[model samples]
Target chain A: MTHNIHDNISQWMKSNEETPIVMSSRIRLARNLENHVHPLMYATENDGFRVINEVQDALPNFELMRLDQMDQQSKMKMVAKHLISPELIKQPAAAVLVNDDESLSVMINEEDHIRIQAMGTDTTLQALYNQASSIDDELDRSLDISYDEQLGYLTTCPTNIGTGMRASVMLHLPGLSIMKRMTRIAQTINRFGYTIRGIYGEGSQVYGHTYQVSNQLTLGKSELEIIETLTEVVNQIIHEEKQIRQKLDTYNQLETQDRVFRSLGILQNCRMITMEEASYRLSEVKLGIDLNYIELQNFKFNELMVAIQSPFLLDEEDDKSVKEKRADILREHIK
Target chain B: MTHNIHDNISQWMKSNEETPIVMSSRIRLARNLENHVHPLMYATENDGFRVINEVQDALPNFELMRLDQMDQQSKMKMVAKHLISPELIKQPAAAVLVNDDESLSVMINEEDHIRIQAMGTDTTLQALYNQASSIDDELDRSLDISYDEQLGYLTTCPTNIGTGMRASVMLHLPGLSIMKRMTRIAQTINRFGYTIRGIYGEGSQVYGHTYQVSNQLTLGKSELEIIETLTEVVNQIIHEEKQIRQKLDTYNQLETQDRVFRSLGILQNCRMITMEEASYRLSEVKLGIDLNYIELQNFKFNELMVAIQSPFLLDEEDDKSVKEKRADILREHIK
Candidate 1:
């Protein structure tokens, strides 16, 4: 039986065995059609639409929404949700097949003809890869996807020639973040052929002490090998994060708790705060909940974190209005 | 009298007082045509050629070499010499106006319509800027370059909207490189709106313990402001490098000298050595000379460093042949 678009595997989030450290896992597969020009060099607007049409026609169950037809507000919402790249949103021919559950998305005419993605909460890279692979297979039945025997996959960028796949894990390493050792650890990670990006992915700044680490050398590795390598690296990072947290608990428990509590207090009562200040303070409060030092009531850390950023906090031109709205939202949620 | 393309200021390198640390300084000005679309987004081959023709016609003294007309070997040589970006070497319309002195080059039909550059040894940013500015002024007389009151100059990338000028110092930070602290220093530099790249700028690996540190935020800063900011930062880095070397002398003189001499000895005798090994060892030997621990010779460190890299050593398909050729070149130089 074919998978339902609305049916999402929510078990990943429900299994909170590992929280605050491993937040989410994602897998993306890049594919291009045979006999078509690569997007970077020669793909025209009409060429982009042809690919989009083929995908939409092939996948009856998937709902293909035209990104160009949407307003700026809707485009920004998709960007905030990680459903599309900013570049894709600006393209006239680009569209996305977003599943009803919002867990799966296929961005058409974004750097490539197709970019199939699956995302789930915490240590679920294998699961995400399976879902993404299944979608890719379904599309392959109708479309003649470009491939090279030696290269594995033919991509516009030479770096993505092999598997044309990327597996990533979003991590919340408060222990390392607070200690400011993230950069040093990131450097070591680069040596092992992995790249560390911020929360939303490349070019975005890290918020709420969140990071997304993924494999870099995709050309030589197979799909399974890439997934396995990332899983091992992510698991090692998770282990290191726990070890650091444990050390902090043993040595600086009182100081850590005091700082966390202080941040929580500010979030509850502050009349006005900048986005930068709110992001940092919210991270502390989230850490407090993760360590079981603070009780979680109606407030959800992840949801609150997203709501505080940009348009969700109200699209105000002036800084004064934006700060006031942010404070109001924080008070309502925290109370 | 107007500045001659053949006549160049040579006193900067002749001073010799600031050698090794401040290897060279470069200033680049990015400019676009008034009514034409930016090169990356909408410029056709004809549009690109038009820009190239205008520049070549205006600058009669300069020799314009069309990159596409050159053979692969000649193109690679230009890339190695930092005359053009790897992307530019592949474009049919792309050409560069290289002065007889080899200190100044104007890349036409690159990401920007024009990229006027001046490079020379040892704290020559001021002189380079003056040369570039004069050339830019000359071009402005013939062509109306794009500009805005608030943005200063318009370009393909938003980062280069204002001023469209970048001043950089190519530094040999052997002390930091040997200590493996370049990454940490680079991270700190990013915070101050400055970026540190490898010898060949973005995407290339750091070779011979060399770094090109330049300004990150070109927007919202004037041409003089950018130059002044970079000058201050470069001076601070040079000071830090000297302090680190002095500390090494005070505490680990014997160990540092031993490593340096061993590398030099290997360079003079080794039958085979990889590019990676050659870069590291040559860096150590160069540092030794800088610290007055080794005697100066007819062999130049900068030239030797560039010669040992990739195709310059030997245009061989296999690693073994390349290594053999690299070792041969090193032995000849140091003997």
Candidate 2:
């Protein structure tokens, strides 16, 4: 269990039920410690430390990995898992508490003082929301939360004033993306205050087929209604993807096989490849595995993508560039 | 006409008819010297100098201002007039030849060896295109132009392979802009291989109420067809703007007068204002004059917007910040 947190593919992704098109559901709640005067701006010097100490007792079983306590490597491992944002992991004052499998975490002194986060490999956002809400309920009893009955939840940002909840669903859309239809799809989705970024959650360059579709700060809507609206959009994308996939297959397996194997050949033979190159080909290979044009015999479909992103992919620690390390890791996984 | 070339407001804008909602129509042609292999790329080091020298004789009356021969002040003066691109003015190898009143200019060694450009206040593109094409005709007789009998004019960029011409219409859209409806209007215009920037020619902060709408590299269409399509879009915008303006006045004339007088008050009284602030207020005041909500007793309305952009706005020159200089200029113009 000591090194389990370092695992790129968490137990939830491996053992939990998977949904087609949709990758995983993450529920994040923006919360402020009561009387702390918004998290970052007006908080007293001691407020962050005090918040972490109180949250430590509230989430007794959860392991609190403060930024100061963890090595850069351990912090990056957390970053890879989406357990904490890249920005939050770099902060000296911040901390995060995670359960054994890291399906749940509470980011301390992030954009907010207390950010309850829960992730699951379920397409349904309710399960993830309920999980995070339970944790919120636990903290509510132990701490005085700054809440307004009329205003709902108060956020440092006025945009997040109502429910103060943000939910995201990871989507794999090779059919739509490669066809260059995202802009039109986004135009349809953009009006709803939802944004689609790379699924890696680091605002890193999106490879070919993945996306992190999340909602806005959205003060006017309820959390339940927001989830339903998001879920509908997810289903619409899933429906469109399946239709396009069928259309692609109807055109015969020729082009798909050509794209899949070409990317496979490049990944297998390259001695060194940049993150951008590795990510693109890796995405193609992932599509190939899903389409049954090729198999991922040595590792899970999700693991390789996350593995390449590890700040330390070589594990042995060599002078060879990060590209070389990524190449080496991909080589081991391809067979 | 000695320093008429440096005057930001050209003669055509002052003498020609002013179309409602539309500001100026500019016609730009992308051409290359014969055997010069796509202007900038295959053109030898001497090719730029040759192009300028040959064009000098081709345009007998035009005065050539090479980058090496010009000061930064003179260059910015050209940029302010849209006679030369901000990028072209900085290139040591580049030069521009302009006629008196600066209506016609042939940029030498820009993105292309020859970029013949013309501007007029008429919303109709025919006059502008004919004005530029006649100069193009004169150059064609003198220089070896890289052309194709069937494939048409070739460009350094593949996107510009066909007619190799671009046209633009300046639009003053205070009614639509203030209503926060440009996005929908832009979306309508955006897909037609057209983009809208601030009317100030430079891509600096867009002030209120004005825009520079231009076409794409646009390989597929003929120059005539392109002009017709752009004219229709311009008319549509002009039509819609008038409708909105009518709608604005129908609402008891209260809001329009409020916005106009408020901006006028700020411009008249403010001690210091940034270029952004000045631009916004100036745009409002321009709208006021057009709507008959105010009178321009001190100076011509078009002249003030252009005058504020003069690198030396105060004209007196002092130790005060550019914002202070801008503020002083506005004070002089208001009454």
Candidate 3:
């Protein structure tokens, strides 16, 4: 059965009411063309088209859109939606195949020959993996994928050689992040062959109290093994976040509420607010919503969080004006 | 031609006289049997024996020793020599193939089915890799090894999957370690897909101001790629350490010399010295020796450093008495 991206989110939000720590689960597989050199070295525009056509032919259900055909605003919109890497938006050879429901997308000729991905809100890594893995298998049958006996899969970068898979979970742990335990936890995960990236992946700063954690070593383990390892780590973090939230509720309930409500008050009434201040205030507001200390009406927490990022601001205004506009936009639903 | 392990070290030490920052180099590969389950799960004594016999037959130059046959003292000596993981000393199914001169050894039935390793004194990872890789290739020809189309090599742990290789340089960064820049350097290396461990491979504390830096991910990269990445990092560290040493000489010449001589004098005359104190003092003395403030007439820096550890004390003496004995041994060398 084909699923839309919104259907996955609605199902996730419905099932994960008590624990909203997991913002999203994503499973991505990196694959390269059998005869072509890595894109960074020798891939031509023709090679990119071959990859795009091959995937499109193999998966007829997907709605393929050549990135070059899309307008600049639409490309930016995709970037903001987390559907494509920012690097792919400007590449003329890159194309994306989004399912009618938008739950799964395949990008051809981006960093690799093909990148199959499935994303879901909340804790649905297993489901996402199943969806992406099936699509990967179908494509594998239609193409000669670059692989090695000793290296697994060949890629532009060496770190993605084995399994060529990256399984990640976007987590919102304001309590843990605020307590400075997130850095310690990230270090611990790094020791276990995992990496913690900021929201929107590599080189991005952590905003809205969000972090993305994924496995760093994928060569020696099976795809299922990578998924299982990440699932265990994410579950542990979720549990830890819940415990911290409980502690905050028990010991500092009034103080926590006051901070959350104060932020809410500022977002509603403040005429000028900086991005830094907006991120902090919105994070606290999210915590309040999760803790049931405040109600969220007419506003989706994830959308609001992403909206405040500079790229998502509706107007091409000065930095100060953009911040002011963001506060104004947020104030509409907050009050 | 067959070469002795001592040959590798003598050559390395002779060639690396100007910059003896690298205390030692090691290259190790992990391999498993095609038909057998991973060691952590279902390998039996018979399976272990089969692996041992097969390796012994293929590489007759290595002196094969069954762990079950060794005395406690011999096993402890191996541990003290940094030749085997502590876990192997207690396992009956484990065996080691040590070259006559002790530069190369392969642990059978350790964490993986086999861990082939070669070691040399300072900047010998390339040479060590050559030795170990050749041996690993020889074993592969004789044994049915477990592998995957996408994972390269399979190990008990996912982190070791791709090449199942780890190349490390043990750096004597006493200046950096003392100045607390070693931790900072380690963090930088970690960011580039490398890890820093204590003198031993894992689960051991950094002793005598020594650190082992090695590649953490081996799957997506070639053997040469791994070696080159580590070489670059080690060279950068050596450069940093030299700069720091020069700064120390220029800025704190008297204080540095006073500290070094004070430690040297204590080793010469003191009746008692604890392990912790010995480690610190010896580190300073080694730094002094490296900087040419002191001459080594009879003292062997590396030997003296290892002798102070608890395992090498040669007696079941209490902590205080062991300290006394260590000081006595060091006194003979210093004077």
User: For model 3, how does the per-residue alpha-carbon lDDT over A107-201 read when each residue is reduced to its tens digit?
Assistant: 77777657777777564567676776677677777767776887677775656777767777777767776776866887888888788777643
DockQ of 1: 0.00
Deviation from native of the Cα of residue B172 in model 2, angstroms: 71
Native contact fraction per model: 0.00, 0.00, 0.00
Candidate 2 backbone overlaps, count: 1
- Per-residue lDDT of candidate 1, residues B142-233 (tens digit): 77777788657777575577777777777777777656777787788888767887674234454337777777777765677777778888
Ranking by lDDT: 1, 3, 2
lDDT of model 2 at residue A57?
A: 79
List the lowest-lDDT window of 10 residues for candidate 2 chain B. Answer: B1-10
lDDT of 1 at A2: 12
Instruction: Pick the winner on lDDT between candidates 1 and 3.
Output: 1
DockQ of each model vs. true complex: 0.00, 0.01, 0.00
Residues B31-87, candidate 2: write the lDDT tens digits. Answer: 666655445654345767766777777657867667886777767765765677766
User: Which stretch of 10 consecutive residues in model 1 chain A shows the poorest summed lDDT?
Assistant: A1-10
- For candidate 1, the per-residue lDDT at A103 reads 79
Question: On a 0 to 100 scale, what is the lDDT of residue A82 in model 1?
Answer: 67
